[PDB]
Design a protein around this ligand. Sequence first.
Ligand code: CMP
Ligand code: CMP
Ligand code: CMP
Ligand code: CMP
Lengths: 200, 197
Amino acid sequence: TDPTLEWFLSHCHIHKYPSKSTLIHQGEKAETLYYIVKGSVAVLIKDEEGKEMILSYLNQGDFIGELGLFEEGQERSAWVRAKTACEVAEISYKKFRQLIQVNPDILMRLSAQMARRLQVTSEKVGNLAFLDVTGRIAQTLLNLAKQPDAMTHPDGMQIKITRQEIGQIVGCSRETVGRILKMLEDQNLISAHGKTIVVY
Amino acid sequence: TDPTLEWFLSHCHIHKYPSKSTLIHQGEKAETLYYIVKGSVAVLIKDEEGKEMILSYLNQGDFIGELGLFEEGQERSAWVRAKTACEVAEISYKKFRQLIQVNPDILMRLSAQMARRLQVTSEKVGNLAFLDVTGRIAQTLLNLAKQPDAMTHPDGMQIKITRQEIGQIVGCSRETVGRILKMLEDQNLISAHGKTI
Ligand SMILES: Nc1ncnc2c1ncn2[C@@H]1O[C@@H]2COP(=O)(O)O[C@H]2[C@H]1O
Ligand SMILES: Nc1ncnc2c1ncn2[C@@H]1O[C@@H]2COP(=O)(O)O[C@H]2[C@H]1O
Ligand SMILES: Nc1ncnc2c1ncn2[C@@H]1O[C@@H]2COP(=O)(O)O[C@H]2[C@H]1O
Ligand SMILES: Nc1ncnc2c1ncn2[C@@H]1O[C@@H]2COP(=O)(O)O[C@H]2[C@H]1O
């Protein structure tokens, strides 16, 4: 076990969220912090007309809703949706702050995650500003081929994801994804036989 | 001022930097945390064609080069360049990690900034994914119209920014900025002296 994590979790109250549930609504009052004990979620934002973009995938071990923690009166900056059934620990910002004074390590862990997320979203700004849709898709296929849920393949790496998701990640239609995925197969960069894609 | 910052700074070595100097180079090994005591800088990234984009402007009171602090063996994720004459404090991650345990309030101030930056950078992703160039420039102008150095012109808010800088923030050429600034001017909501609009 991890003494610090277990120490922290003992000050939290756990709850469950079924797949497709919305844990955090954008615009909502930020006053609580979350910690994914089990499961995975998606962090989403939207344009004026319902188009959704996935900012990130968070998983077991990741903190959520930390952005309103250092300043009161702030609202949630995005929507968080359960991809799979989730077990989440929740604690008020007030209590977490008291825990910080007790052992700063817990904030160091939270901050490390914030730093990673900043690095990743910054690279996201890069892809959106410098690459055409073909480049973003190809870059996203390579990215996923490194994540944990990524498997090993005799011809490379295998991943499980739908065209809709790819679209929400790179900012394009599922049909555009479908067409681009095929063109990348003709370029012998990947192999698409189902929602499973083999990347070389 | 405040005891916490003075205390923190008393443990730092302060230095001055000319207006166009590079404080941080992307890819370098990270073992140093910086704090802007005076002046301002630009955070940048580049594409494989040399084109640069401004991820953010940082100013007095802002920590910089903090992303490599939470884990060993990390490299700078971007270039940080002074936009004006700077006065920057610095300190080893090793010694900062000790100050954190003596008084976590200093870590709270740094993390507070990381949070804001993540919100702002996430908003940048939205702008790039959902708005056309004209929309991005228009929003960028409104944004700058609240920044540190935003004059109080009678017709509204006055700012100072080059076409090139506008281009680097929204992601387009300075020629496209010029044309669109012209359009925004024929319509309205143009208070930039960067080049007069
Ligand atoms: N760019 C991002 N990358 C990862 N997680 C994010 C990003 N933007 C927002 N979030 C998370 O989504 C949450 C939405 O509500 P909060 O602002 O409380 O906290 C936010 C973060 O935990
Ligand atoms: N610029 C964009 N153009 C089109 N769809 C986008 C864009 N940015 C995000 N999306 C979203 O990504 C989704 C991909 O699958 P859909 O076609 O079902 O719906 C799409 C939109 O919700
Ligand atoms: N999106 C961003 N917003 C603000 N500052 C950033 C951003 N990305 C990188 N930086 C700064 O640029 C630095 C580059 O790598 P560092 O680890 O030095 O720490 C980073 C931050 O201080
Ligand atoms: N997608 C892009 N298209 C054009 N210029 C860009 C883009 N992204 C960033 N830039 C930069 O923004 C700068 C604006 O001024 P310049 O035209 O001199 O040079 C431009 C490039 O360096």
